[PDB]
Design an enzyme around this catalytic site. Structure first.
Site, PDB file in Angstrom:
ATOM      1  N   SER A 196       0.751  -1.123  -0.030  1.00  0.00           N
ATOM      2  CA  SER A 196       0.025   0.069   0.049  1.00  0.00           C
ATOM      3  C   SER A 196       1.005   1.101   0.109  1.00  0.00           C
ATOM      4  O   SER A 196       1.736   1.314  -0.966  1.00  0.00           O
ATOM      5  CB  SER A 196      -1.106  -0.054   1.210  1.00  0.00           C
ATOM      6  N   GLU A 323      -8.940  -5.469  -4.435  1.00  0.00           N
ATOM      7  CA  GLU A 323      -8.383  -4.307  -3.845  1.00  0.00           C
ATOM      8  C   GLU A 323      -9.287  -3.496  -3.172  1.00  0.00           C
ATOM      9  O   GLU A 323      -9.152  -2.953  -2.309  1.00  0.00           O
ATOM     10  CB  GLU A 323      -7.099  -3.630  -4.757  1.00  0.00           C
ATOM     11  N   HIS A 432      -7.621  -6.051  -0.253  1.00  0.00           N
ATOM     12  CA  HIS A 432      -6.460  -5.188   0.040  1.00  0.00           C
ATOM     13  C   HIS A 432      -5.755  -5.508   1.558  1.00  0.00           C
ATOM     14  O   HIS A 432      -6.637  -5.857   2.351  1.00  0.00           O
ATOM     15  CB  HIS A 432      -6.838  -4.037   0.213  1.00  0.00           C
TER      16      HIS A 432
HETATM   17  C1  LIG Z   1      -3.664  -1.527   6.811  1.00  0.00           C
HETATM   18  N1  LIG Z   1      -2.994  -1.818   5.515  1.00  0.00           N
HETATM   19  C2  LIG Z   1      -2.856  -0.648   4.765  1.00  0.00           C
HETATM   20  C3  LIG Z   1      -1.573  -2.514   5.533  1.00  0.00           C
HETATM   21  C4  LIG Z   1      -3.967  -2.726   4.995  1.00  0.00           C
HETATM   22  C5  LIG Z   1      -5.470  -2.375   4.674  1.00  0.00           C
HETATM   23  C6  LIG Z   1      -6.510  -3.164   4.331  1.00  0.00           C
HETATM   24  C7  LIG Z   1      -7.691  -2.873   4.465  1.00  0.00           C
HETATM   25  C8  LIG Z   1      -8.170  -2.846   6.118  1.00  0.00           C
HETATM   26  C9  LIG Z   1      -9.435  -1.930   6.081  1.00  0.00           C
HETATM   27  C10 LIG Z   1      -8.885  -0.665   6.055  1.00  0.00           C
HETATM   28  C11 LIG Z   1     -10.219   0.514   5.734  1.00  0.00           C
HETATM   29  C12 LIG Z   1      -9.386   1.761   5.986  1.00  0.00           C
HETATM   30  C13 LIG Z   1     -10.618   2.842   5.898  1.00  0.00           C
HETATM   31  N2  LIG Z   1      -9.785   4.222   6.240  1.00  0.00           N
HETATM   32  C14 LIG Z   1      -8.680   4.461   5.124  1.00  0.00           C
HETATM   33  C15 LIG Z   1     -10.976   5.294   5.883  1.00  0.00           C
HETATM   34  C16 LIG Z   1      -9.576   4.213   7.513  1.00  0.00           C
END
Ligand SMILES: C[N+](C)(C)CCCCCCCCCC[N+](C)(C)C
Ligand SMILES: *[C@@H]1O[C@H](CO[C@H]2O[C@@H](C)[C@@H](O)[C@@H](O)[C@@H]2O)[C@@H](O[C@@H]2O[C@H](CO)[C@@H](O)[C@H](O)[C@H]2NC(C)=O)[C@H](O)[C@H]1NC(C)=O
Ligand SMILES: *[C@@H]1O[C@H](CO[C@H]2O[C@@H](C)[C@@H](O)[C@@H](O)[C@@H]2O)[C@@H](O[C@@H]2O[C@H](CO)[C@@H](O)[C@H](O)[C@H]2NC(C)=O)[C@H](O)[C@H]1NC(C)=O
Ligand SMILES: *[C@@H]1O[C@H](CO)[C@@H](O)[C@H](O)[C@H]1NC(C)=O
Ligand SMILES: *[C@@H]1O[C@H](CO)[C@@H](O)[C@H](O)[C@H]1NC(C)=O
Ligand SMILES: *[C@@H]1O[C@H](CO)[C@@H](O)[C@H](O)[C@H]1NC(C)=O
Ligand SMILES: *[C@@H]1O[C@H](CO)[C@@H](O)[C@H](O)[C@H]1NC(C)=O
Ligand SMILES: [Cl-]
Ligand SMILES: [Cl-]
Ligand SMILES: [Cl-]
EC number: 3.1.1.8
Length: 523
Positions: A196, A323, A432
Site C-alpha cells: 500500500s 483491492e 487489500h
Molecule cells: C492497513 N493496511 C493498509 C496495511 C492494509 C489495510 C487493508 C484494508 C483494511 C481495512 C482498511 C479500511 C481503511 C478505511 N480508512 C482508510 C477510511 C481508514
C-alpha cells in the site's frame, strides 16, 4: 546473551524459538533523534552514541496517528490499528537474525503502508521471525512518521520541507548500510518490500537519488507512486498546510512563524484537525503525503518515470483480486460488512460520487457505462472493481510497464486466494492487505488454523520472495512449479498466486486499465 556492537553502541536482543529452531530478534533499536520540540516537522537528525547497552527487547512506540474506530471490537479493522503506545518518539527499527548468525545474509526491509497516515512495524502480520527462520534472510522494519507530522509541506522551508516520513525510512536504510554487517547481513544485498503506501514509498525510493545506493532491488505489493492517492500536488500541499494552521489558530503571515506555532500544539490537536484540511474526501484520501520537495524528489515523479530517471534494478510488483472492496463499507450507501451488500443501480451511482467527488457528471457516467456490460450482485461487484482498478491495479500495471521499458527485469503477480481465516464477509473476496500474512509466512505456523493448502501457498510465496531478494529471480525451483516469466512491455505476462494451480496470463484488466490510464485523465 547475544549482544551486537553497532556504530552508535551495543544493543541487546533476545532469542525466539521458531519451528524447532532459534531466531534472534532486536526490537526497538533507535535510528534517529526523537523528533520532538524544535525537531518536529524537520528531517530526522542522526543519533549520538550511548556508552551502555540498549535493550532492544520489545517493540517501541508507534508514531502518532488517528485510529480506525469504524468497527470497535472487530478484528478485521482493529488488527491494523497500532499495538504499542502512540508517541512522537517513534523512530525505531526492528531486525530479525537467523540462528546461528549468518555469514552474509540477504536483507529484506519492510515498509508498512496505511495511506501515509497510519501504520506501524510492530503489527502481528509484519513479524519477520518466520522469514528469518525459514529462508535464513535478515528482516528489518522501521517506524516512520505519518500524517501531518511526517508529510506537512512548505516547499523549500527546512522547518517543514515535506517528505519527512520518507527521510525517516531513508535514514533507516542508511542504518542498515552502516550496521547490518555486524548482524551477519550483506549491505550489498538489500531488498525493499512494502505494501500500500509502503509500496508507493518503495517506488519513490527507486526515484530518489539519495536512496539509490541504499538498496539493491524492490518489491511493490498493492501500491505505487502513480496511484491517484499517493502524491499530493504542491498547490494542494500548501492549501492543506494553511488550512491546518487556520484550524489550529496558527495562521501567521511569516510562513516560518506558522510552523513554530504548530510546534507548540499538542499532537492530538494536529491529529484531530488532519481530516478537515480538504473540503471533500474519500475513504482513500491521503491528506498529507509525499510531495515534490526538491530534495527527496527532484521533479514530478511521473516525469522521472516516463523519462527513465530511476534506479536500474529488478522489481517485483503485484496486486490482489479485490483491492477495492474493503473501502466500500467506509462511505458507500447500501454497503455493510454484515450483509451481502446487494446494491441497486442508483446506489452504484451514489457510490461513484463518494469515491469520485470532484469528477464531472460525464466522467461518472463514463465509469458507469464502462463497468455495466454484464445477477443481483452486478452493481456491488462493479463498484468494488471500479475502486480497485482505479486506485491500485491499473496504476501498478502502468508503473511496471514504464519501469520495464528501460530494460530491467520485472515480475508481476495477481494474488487471488482469500484467507480461510478472513474475518470480513465473503463478498469482499481477496481484500487489500491480506496477502501480507502469506508473504511473512504466518500460515507456516500450523497451530494458527490455516489450511494445509495455505501452508503450501505461503511456503511457495516465501521462497519466491526470498529468491527474488537473493538472486533477482522469483522462482520456486524445486517443486515442479510454474516458472515466473518476465513482465515485458508488449506481452505483459504475469503470474497468478492461488492454491489450485498457478497460471501464466497476459494483459491483466486490459480493457479496464485502458479506460483509467488513457481516457479517464481527460475528463
Ligand atoms: C492497513 N493496511 C493498509 C496495511 C492494509 C489495510 C487493508 C484494508 C483494511 C481495512 C482498511 C479500511 C481503511 C478505511 N480508512 C482508510 C477510511 C481508514
Ligand atoms: C483550499 O482550502 C480552502 C479552505 O478550506 C476550508 O474549508 C474546509 C475544508 C474546512 O476544513 C475549513 O476549516 C477550511 O479552512 C478551501 O475552501 C473551501 O472550498 C469549499 C469548496 O470549494 C467551499 O465549500 C468552502 O466555502 C471554501 N472555504 C473558503 C474559506 O473559501 C478550498 O476548497 C481548498 N482548495 C481546493 C482546491 O480544494
Ligand atoms: C445491508 O446493511 C446496510 C447497512 O445497514 C446499517 O444500518 C442498520 C439498518 C443495520 O441493520 C446494519 O445493517 C447496518 O449498520 C443497509 O443499508 C442501510 O439500510 C437502511 C434501510 O433498511 C437505511 O435506512 C440506511 O440508511 C442504510 N445505510 C447505509 C449506509 O446504506 C442495507 O440495506 C443492507 N442490505 C441488505 C439487507 O440487503
Ligand atoms: C536490560 O536488560 C537486562 C536483562 O538482565 C537488565 O539486567 C538491564 O538492567 C536492562 N537495562 C536497563 C533496564 O536499562
Ligand atoms: C558478502 O557478499 C558480497 C557480494 O554480494 C561480497 O562483496 C562481500 O565481501 C561479502 N561479505 C562477507 C563474505 O563478509
Ligand atoms: C520570518 O521569521 C524568520 C525567523 O525569525 C526570519 O528569519 C525571517 O526574516 C522572517 N520573515 C520576514 C520578516 O519576512
Ligand atoms: C517442496 O515440497 C516439499 C514436499 O514435497 C515441501 O516439504 C517443501 O516445503 C516445498 N518447498 C517449497 C519451497 O514449496
Ligand atoms: Cl477477476
Ligand atoms: Cl486443512
Ligand atoms: Cl504450481
Amino acid at each position: 546473551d547475544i549482544i551486537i556492537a553497532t556504530k552508535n553502541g551495543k544493543v541487546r536482543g533476545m532469542q525466539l524459538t521458531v519451528f524447532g529452531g532459534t531466531v534472534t530478534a532486536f526490537l526497538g533499536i533507535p535510528y534517529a533523534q526523537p523528533p520532538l520540540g524544535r525537531l518536529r516537522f524537520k528531517k530526522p537528525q542522526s543519533l549520538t552514541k550511548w556508552s551502555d547497552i540498549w535493550n532492544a527487547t520489545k517493540y517501541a512506540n508507534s508514531c502518532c496517528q488517528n485510529i480506525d474506530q469504524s468497527f470497535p471490537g472487530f478484528h478485521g479493522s482493529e488488527m491494523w490499528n497500532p499495538n504499542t503506545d502512540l508517541s512522537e518518539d517513534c523512530l525505531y527499527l526492528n531486525v530479525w537474525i537467523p540462528a546461528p548468525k549468518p555469514k552474509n545474509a540477504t536483507v529484506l526491509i519492510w515498509i508498512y503502508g496505511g495511506g501515509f497516515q497510519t501504520g506501524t512495524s510492530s503489527l502481528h502480520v509484519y513479524d519477520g521471525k518466520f522469514l528469518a527462520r525459514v529462508e535464513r534472510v535478515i528482516v528489518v522494519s522501521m517506524n516512520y512518521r505519518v500524517g501531518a507530522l511526517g508529510f506537512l509541506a512548505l516547499p523549500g522551508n527546512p522547518e517543514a520541507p515535506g517528505n519527512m516520513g520518507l527521510f525517516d525510512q531513508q535514514l533507516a536504510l542508511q542504518w542498515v548500510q552502516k550496521n547490518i554487517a555486524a548482524f551477519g547481513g550483506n549491505p550489498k544485498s538489500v531488498t525493499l518490500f512494502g505494501e500500500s503506501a509502503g509500496a508507493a514509498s518503495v517506488s519513490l525510493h527507486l526515484l530518489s537519488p539519495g536512496s539509490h545506493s541504499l538498496f539493491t532491488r524492490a518489491i511493490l505489493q498493492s501500491g505505487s507512486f502513480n496511484a491517484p492517492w499517493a502524491v499530493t500536488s504542491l498547490y494542494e500541499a500548501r492549501n492543506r498546510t494553511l488550512n491546518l494552521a487556520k484550524l489550529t489558530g496558527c495562521s501567521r503571515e511569516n510562513e516560518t512563524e506558522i510552523i513554530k506555532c504548530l510546534r507548540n500544539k499538542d499532537p492530538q490537536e494536529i491529529l484531530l484537525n488532519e481530516a478537515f484540511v480538504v473540503p471533500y474526501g474519500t475513504p482513500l484520501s491521503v491528506n498529507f503525503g509525499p510531495t515534490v520537495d526538491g530534495d527527496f524528489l527532484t521533479d514530478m515523479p511521473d516525469i522521472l518515470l516516463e523519462l527513465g530517471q530511476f534506479k536500474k534494478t529488478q522489481i517485483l510488483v503485484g496486486v490482489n483480486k479485490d483491492e477495492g472492496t474493503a473501502f466500500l463499507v467506509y462511505g458507500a450507501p447500501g454497503f455493510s460488512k454484515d450483509n451481502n451488500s446487494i446494491i441497486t443501480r442508483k446506489e452504484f451511482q451514489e457510490g461513484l460520487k463518494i469515491f469520485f467527488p470532484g469528477v464531472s457528471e460525464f466522467g461518472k457516467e463514463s465509469i458507469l457505462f464502462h463497468y455495466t456490460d454484464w445477477r443481483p450482485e452486478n452493481y456491488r461487484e462493479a463498484l468494488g472493481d471500479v475502486v480497485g482498478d482505479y486506485n491500485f491495479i491499473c496504476p501498478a500495471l502502468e508503473f511496471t510497464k514504464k519501469f520495464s521499458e528501460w530494460g530491467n527485469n520485472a515480475f508481476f503477480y495477481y494474488f487471488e486466494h482469500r484467507s480461510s481465516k478472513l474475518p470480513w464477509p465473503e463478498w469482499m473476496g481477496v481484500m487489500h492487505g491480506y496477502e501480507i500474512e502469506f508473504v511473512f509466512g504466518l500460515p507456516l505456523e500450523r497451530r494458527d488454523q490455516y489450511t494445509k493448502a495455505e501452508e503450501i501457498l505461503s511456503r511457495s510465496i516465501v521462497k519466491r520472495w526470498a529468491n527474488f531478494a537473493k538472486y533477482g529471480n522469483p522462482q520456486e525451483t524445486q517443486n515442479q512449479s510454474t516458472s515466473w516469466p518476465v513482465f515485458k512491455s508488449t506481452e505483459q505476462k504475469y503470474l497468478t498466486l492461488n492454491t489450485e494451480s498457478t497460471r501464466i496470463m497476459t494483459k491483466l484488466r486490459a480493457q479496464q486499465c485502458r479506460f483509467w490510464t488513457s481516457f479517464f485523465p481527460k475528463v
